[PDB]
Amino acid sequence: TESYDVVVVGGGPVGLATAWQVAERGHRVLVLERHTFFNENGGTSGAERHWRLQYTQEDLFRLTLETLPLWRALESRCERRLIHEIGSLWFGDTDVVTNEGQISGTAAMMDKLSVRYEWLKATDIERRFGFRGLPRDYEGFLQPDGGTIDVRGTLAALFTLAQAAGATLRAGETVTELVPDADGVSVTTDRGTYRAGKVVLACGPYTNDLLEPLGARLAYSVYEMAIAAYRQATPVTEAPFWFAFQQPTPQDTNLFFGFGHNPWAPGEFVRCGPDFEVDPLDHPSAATGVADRRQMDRLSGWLRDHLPTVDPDPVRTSTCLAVLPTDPERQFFLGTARDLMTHGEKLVVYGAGWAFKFVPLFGRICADLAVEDSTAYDISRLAPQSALLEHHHH
Ligand SMILES: *Cc1cc2c(cc1C)nc1c(=O)[nH]c(=O)nc-1n2C[C@H](O)[C@H](O)[C@H](O)COP(=O)(O)OP(=O)(O)OC[C@H]1O[C@@H](n2cnc3c(N)ncnc32)[C@H](O)[C@@H]1O
Ligand SMILES: O=C(O)c1ccccn1
Hints:
Elements: E1 2-9, H1 13-24, E2 29-33, E3 48-51, H2 58-78, E4 83-85, E5 88-92, H3 103-113, E6 118-121, H4 122-129, E7 139-143, E8 147-150, H5 151-164, E9 168-171, E10 175-181, E11 184-189, E12 193-201, H6 207-211, E13 220-231, E14 241-245, E15 256-258, E16 269-274, H7 293-306, E17 316-325, E18 333-336, E19 347-352, H8 359-371
Parallel strand pairs: 1-2, 1-12, 2-9, 5-14, 12-19
Antiparallel strand pairs: 3-8, 4-8, 5-7, 6-7, 10-11, 11-12, 13-16, 13-17, 14-15, 15-16, 18-19
Helix pairs in contact: 1-5, 1-8
The structure holds flavin-adenine dinucleotide (FAD) and pyridine-2-carboxylic acid (6PC).
Keywords: FAD, Flavoprotein, Nucleotide-binding, Oxidoreductase
InterPro entries: FAD-dep_OxRdtase, FAD/NAD-bd_sf, MTOX
Organism: Streptomyces tendae
């Protein structure tokens, strides 16, 4: 049984960022990853992730401002620009309400927070970005500060920095049991056992598998989402991230999005996807890894009709797992398990969120809680929510 100050369960971006921060602070940290580092079987896949500035949720705007300096520090340390301002384009029917929100409502929130944007008409959208055949009443905005994030560059940086700082990184090892006590946590994996001062759970959609035996269950839902990669057919002029807000059809939500071009890449491929209603998985093992045929056909057909800048026959289709609070009013689960079980403060939990954009911040917060039990950042609205009735003594 090896002993560490902190054991991180999960070697995705949040786990690696936490380990880098813990090790740089001079504590002994071990990261246990069930598959391989850089795997694309959890919530981290593809080459890119979006970082918009526009939100109707005040807390997301605040987190965005607090994370930016942390991205800059990371970029400096690894000698790589990781965030690229390519723009965030939201267009279509400006009043339809979707899981992404509503154009008009969001534009009012930008007006209020003093976030700049340009309002565009269908003809401007087709001219500037290459879309074709849009209904002439479609409108929307371009928030120029919207960015795209180099996912592979970020993972490489975090892995290398964590390793250089002394973190012990082990792959192909699955954590199967956690038992906190007053003096630390006992960790069992399919390869051995460990003793930790505290454990950070950054295991994507698997958090409940380790909390269940301890009498806790968090209120999050897991979704397998389809994504398709397409070859760029015509050279880009402006290729921002885009989301098409439309009225639903009787069979689907009729929503589609594209991540935009990847500046660090040769400009050969881009990725897009449908944003259709998807029922939650009962457990992550239910994921198949095969993108839903009908959704891929709908997306490819829409791109054939409306965005001829890309060859609409996908080069590759795949899936990614989203892990989100079941309550749409909540954005993230980041905190300890202090209110969920005895000695719960010894388990630091990153349990749900649409969060690649906050990876440097979340890693710092998890490191703070792992070695101090407190962070200077406000995480009051991110408290992990129990899926069970409260019957325990507090
Ligand atoms: C799927 C998805 C997510 C997404 C997105 C689009 C799609 C299709 N677009 C985003 C965007 O534009 N902007 C953004 O900020 N986020 C966006 N997301 C979400 C983002 O990708 C996720 O928030 C992020 O990937 C989460 O990272 P995290 O590090 O939390 O999790 P992970 O990569 O799933 O890694 C967890 C690791 O844990 C390992 N694991 C699991 N169980 C165990 C056990 N028992 N023992 C050891 N290791 C374990 C996994 O193997 C994994 O590597
Ligand atoms: O606004 C976002 O963050 C978003 C939406 C759909 C797909 C990817 N990113």
